[PDB]
Amino acid sequence: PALTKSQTDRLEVLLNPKDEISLNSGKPFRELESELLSRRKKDLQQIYAEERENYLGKLEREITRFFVDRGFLEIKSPILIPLEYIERMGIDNDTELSKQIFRVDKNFCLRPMLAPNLANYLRKLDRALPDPIKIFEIGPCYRKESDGKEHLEEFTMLNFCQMGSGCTRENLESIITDFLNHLGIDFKIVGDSCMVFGDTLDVMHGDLELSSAVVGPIPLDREWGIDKPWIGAGFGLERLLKVKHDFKNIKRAARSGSYYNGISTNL
Amino acid sequence: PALTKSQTDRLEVLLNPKDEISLNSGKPFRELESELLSRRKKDLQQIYAEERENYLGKLEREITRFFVDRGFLEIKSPILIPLEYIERMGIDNDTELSKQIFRVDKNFCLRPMLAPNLANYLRKLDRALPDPIKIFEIGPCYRKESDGKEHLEEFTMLNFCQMGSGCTRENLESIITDFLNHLGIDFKIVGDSCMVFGDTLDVMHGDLELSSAVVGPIPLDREWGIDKPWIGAGFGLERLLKVKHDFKNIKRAARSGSYYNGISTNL
Ligand SMILES: Nc1ncnc2c1ncn2[C@@H]1O[C@H](COP(=O)(O)OP(=O)(O)OP(=O)(O)O)[C@@H](O)[C@H]1O
Ligand SMILES: Nc1ncnc2c1ncn2[C@@H]1O[C@H](COP(=O)(O)OP(=O)(O)OP(=O)(O)O)[C@@H](O)[C@H]1O
Ligand SMILES: C[Si](C)(C)COC(=O)NCCCC[C@H](N)C(=O)O
Ligand SMILES: C[Si](C)(C)COC(=O)NCCCC[C@H](N)C(=O)O
Ligand SMILES: [Mg+2]
Ligand SMILES: [Mg+2]
Ligand SMILES: [Mg+2]
Ligand SMILES: [Mg+2]
Ligand SMILES: [Mg+2]
Ligand SMILES: [Mg+2]
């Protein structure tokens, strides 16, 4: 009555966090699979009858309303960006993040972060809008990754940011606090450091990094024409979903043809 | 008192459809530019004070609510897809659409359409959901294009589709009709033809193609495991915005760092 690795992997695809089912109790694979298949078909039928919204889409909409209502302008900027942005962000051609970049043709890449486009918007909008400038964006970003439990190659970033008055550590933490309180997600702030921005305030849920946040100014500002105080933070939406729904693997949360709202589509 | 091409191009960037300003009345460039700059700064200040929603984001949300309320499941599938999907869609390696594909690395590409991922979802969901299967997706798609007035290289597609009962020409036209009536956009349906799907019902606003729609079955179905009647239609959101806002160029509607809700960001 032992299960093979293939059998265990199939049952794990079909298992969901709310289940409490022992995969190696000695019940045969056929019965465990049939039970989980029936649970998951019922779950998908209930989604189709009663809500029909995609978790990533619904969370984006929820986050958008939060930031629009707090005075931030909603941005939708290019996902396909100049490759020259990477070197200008101080991503040394090197190894690290630089090796994670998906190149497109000769001179383009898929953005790995929203920051460069938002920096350009802060600079441009400061010529027309009253102080402070508050903007945010949600959308796809791309990195080649090796890991699998907390990393996706195609994921969804929120970055909000502000330039002008009010760009203090305490106001940044207060926005993060109000935001994650709105989502019902507990967290702590820990110092960390990265090659692009320097010191970061990392927003942690246990050992899971939900965000890196930054208080400017930083030396990179000159190369982007940023010449005022600023604050900003980038969050992964699939990581937020992973926490909210207690997923074991971030792939449950991803754009995917393999899962719908964390339910296997292989039924 | 004549304007150069550079001067005329600058004024056209700053002009908006609601203006009624003659660029070559003989008023000097400096006064025309100052007047338009003041109008556009006021327009952006009003957006920032009172709405703050991005046109593409807001239209996606409006469309999503429409289709969710009509019983369609909201899908968010990969934008970065296998290159093998292109050949399997019958996009002959050839010239035409095939030359329009943005390749990523060796084996991936940016999707040029939502159809292949939605075909996979229809097939998979038919194993779990009751007839008919109704799904839709909105999101970025990518084509190398030459044109500039009605084409973008990075644009936003809506595709809705249905499989099972009810997949008739009359029901397809009725959905299109209810949808564009909800948006307030007049249209007509004209026959056309394309290499992937064959005969299409093209949804036209004047000479502007808003959508191609298709009544299955088609011979491509076998290669995607589709084995029931189906209907579907793909719409460009920036083209819908172009019509709604009377933009002269689709770039006003695009993801862009150069325009915000059709207003130049170069102020
Ligand atoms: N590959 C990925 N998949 C999913 N989410 C990610 C990925 N990379 C980054 N994020 C999310 O985006 C946020 C901001 O990006 P940032 O550059 O700080 O990530 P990071 O420090 O490289 O994250 P990690 O150390 O976990 O790799 C991260 O805190 C995380 O929530
Ligand atoms: N490059 C583009 N930019 C903006 N919208 C586009 C683009 N290509 C297609 N669309 C939109 O997507 C819809 C469905 O795609 P489809 O493949 O039918 O386009 P198409 O027939 O190639 O359009 P066209 O003949 O105008 O090039 C189109 O009706 C249009 O509204
Ligand atoms: C020219 Si700048 C990149 C140095 C300053 O202005 C911005 O572009 N603001 C949004 C991004 C800030 C960092 C982001 N918060 C993060 O740590 O993920
Ligand atoms: C395996 Si199929 C591609 C042959 C059938 O099922 C679907 O994938 N449905 C959505 C896409 C249909 C065509 C789209 N409406 C268009 O003309 O843009
Ligand atoms: Mg990382
Ligand atoms: Mg980190
Ligand atoms: Mg980080
Ligand atoms: Mg075309
Ligand atoms: Mg056409
Ligand atoms: Mg067409």
Summarize this structure briefly:
Chain A has 8 helices and 12 strands. Chain A has 267 residues and is α+β, with helices and mostly antiparallel strands. Bound molecules: adenosine-5'-triphosphate (ATP) (2 copies), the ligand C[Si](C)(C)COC(=O)NCCCC[C@H](N)C(=O)O (2 copies) and magnesium ion (6 copies).
Topology of helices and strands:
2 copies of one chain form a homodimer.
Chain A: H1 5-14, H2 29-50, H3 55-69, E1 73-75, E2 80-82, H4 84-88, H5 96-99, E3 103-104, E4 108-110, H6 115-125, E5 133-142, E6 154-163, H7 169-183, E7 188-194, E8 198-205, E9 208-215, E10 230-236, H8 237-245, E11 259-260, E12 263-264
Parallel strand pairs in A: 1-5
Antiparallel strand pairs in A: 2-4, 3-4, 5-6, 6-10, 7-8, 8-9, 9-10, 11-12
Helix pairs in contact in A: 1-2
Bound molecules: adenosine-5'-triphosphate (2 copies), the ligand C[Si](C)(C)COC(=O)NCCCC[C@H](N)C(=O)O (2 copies) and magnesium ion (6 copies).
**How are the strands of the largest sheet of chain A arranged?**
1-5-6-10-9-8-7
Could you tell me how far the N terminus lies from the C terminus of chain A, measured between alpha carbons in angstroms? 24 Å
Compute the number of structural domains of chain A: 2
Helical stretch tally of chain A: 8
**Count of strand segments of chain A:** 12
CATH homologous superfamily annotation of the largest domain in chain A: Bira Bifunctional Protein, Domain 2
CATH level 3 topology of the largest domain in chain A:
BirA Bifunctional Protein, domain 2
Helix content of chain A: 25-40%
**What's the CATH C level of the largest domain in chain A?**
Alpha Beta
SS content category of chain A: alpha+beta
Order of helices and strands of chain A: HHHEEHHEEHEEHEEEEHEE
The CATH architecture name of the largest domain in chain A reads 2-Layer Sandwich
PDB class: translation
Keywords: aminoacyl-tRNA synthetase, non-natural amino acids, tRNA
Assembly: dimeric
Entry title: Crystal structure of Methanosarcina mazei PylRS(Y306A/Y384F) complexed with TeocLys
